[model samples]
Target: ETFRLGVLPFGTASWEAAVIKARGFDTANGFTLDIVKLAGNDAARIAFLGGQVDAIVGDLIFAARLGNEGRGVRFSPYSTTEGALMVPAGSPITDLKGLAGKRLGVAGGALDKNWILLRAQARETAGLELENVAQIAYGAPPLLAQKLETGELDAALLYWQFAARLEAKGFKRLISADDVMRAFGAKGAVSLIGYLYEGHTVADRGEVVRGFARASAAAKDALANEPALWETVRPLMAAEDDATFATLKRDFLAGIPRRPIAAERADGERIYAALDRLAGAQLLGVGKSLPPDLYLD
Candidate 1:
């Protein structure tokens, strides 16, 4: 059977395509994987919940929100590439404290989610109020850059690779969510990609898990053995071909630990904990619910 997979159009697109294009996993395994790119998590979740696709690719937070909403969606092995926070070149917004009452730009949902978690941390650590902070919302990273360059925004939250690209373009970063993760001293959590499946598929979950193991292992191997893979991954980056892709790949592979490893399940727990805390006072009316263990399927 063909597995309809939904993915974001970011860094991992080409990697996923390379895997399918070369029939990397399909050659050894007799199954078809159709990869469809979605604009963002919102659209992906809509399609997945609408039953337009069998599976989806997204971060732990997205799956957590879905599970929290009682939608019964789950993710298995995560496929992390690059995601981070970016600030202007040589700006002085040093720590999370500096962001108080200052304008912080977010590239929509995930960054917004991160901001929510940051607030949670403040509440837990320093008893600070997150509502007093100003968040300037731009559509995505590029728009955040446009506004930041124009001095319309004090600082913006962006993905790490794009943040790295911003640095290459003469912009400097003050801090990143990754740095924040480190601050939390989280050890095993933080899986970037996962196989999102609906609860109805529980009966066939084992086969699904097996497919994810095959595809994930295949993608990891491609990134490892094929140093030339960067040739294709470069242009997709906003930074200069050689320099941008070089830094992008270096950081991408560097931050991601090759395989999902043992605590892959805890990835959801860690991120959800972050989100709940970040969005402490903000009311989206979404209750605090946990991801199901069936997520592995």
Candidate 2:
């Protein structure tokens, strides 16, 4: 059977796994992977909700929100990492307090994970009000990067992979989203990003879903263990130099979950609980709490 999976063009786990599929790894798992490239996260979400694809890449919060709304979406997280809070090279802004009254670039809208987490951290830990900061929404990664480069933003809260690129250019990381999550009582292996599949996809096409998971797990393992396989997707990464490429690879590998992708309800509940307590109404916009069963298994 063939699994139609939607992936972003960014250098995320889903994107890398799609590259692995292009290299015939899916065949090894007894199925074919049809990688459908979507324009961005919003497009991916629309595609999944409209039934254009069997599954799409998204974060735990997104999966939980969908499931909470009885959308029949279940999530299997493939990777975990904190988003990056970065500043230009040699900027004196070393902490969240320094962001007060300064322009901060947000890749997505004001409700994005990085923004939400950072805002929570500022209010909870630093006693600073992130609302005081000038948050300029750029709407996309490239636009956010561009604004940061053009000095339109003093800092940017970006996805980890793109943050690595900025780090390669001498940008400094002030704090990580993982640290904020941990401080907020989230424990081991939080699901930052994963694949969201519909309930029907799992019930009617179990083998195909598991096959995709198996191939993805194998691809992640291969990328971590074998440096040579990085070459296969290196072109998709679009790193300017060898050193930047190495940094991106190292950063990405560090984010692979310690456990294989599965329906781990405990961790999911912990994360969902934290998010629900902290920013549920604001970020997720769901009136009711999400149920515990958020996995596809």
Best model number under lDDT: 2
**Cα lDDT, model 2, residue 2:** 78
- The digit string of per-residue lDDT tens for model 2 on 123-213 reads 6666565766565555687777777878888888888777767777768777777777777877675766778886788889888888887
lDDT of 1 by residue, 9-69 (tens): 7545446555554645754555677777787767877888888877776555666677766
List TM-score per model, in order: 0.82, 0.90
Q: What's model 2's TM-score?
A: 0.90
Residue 206 Cα positional deviation in candidate 1, in Å, after optimal superposition: 4.9
lDDT of each: 0.62, 0.73
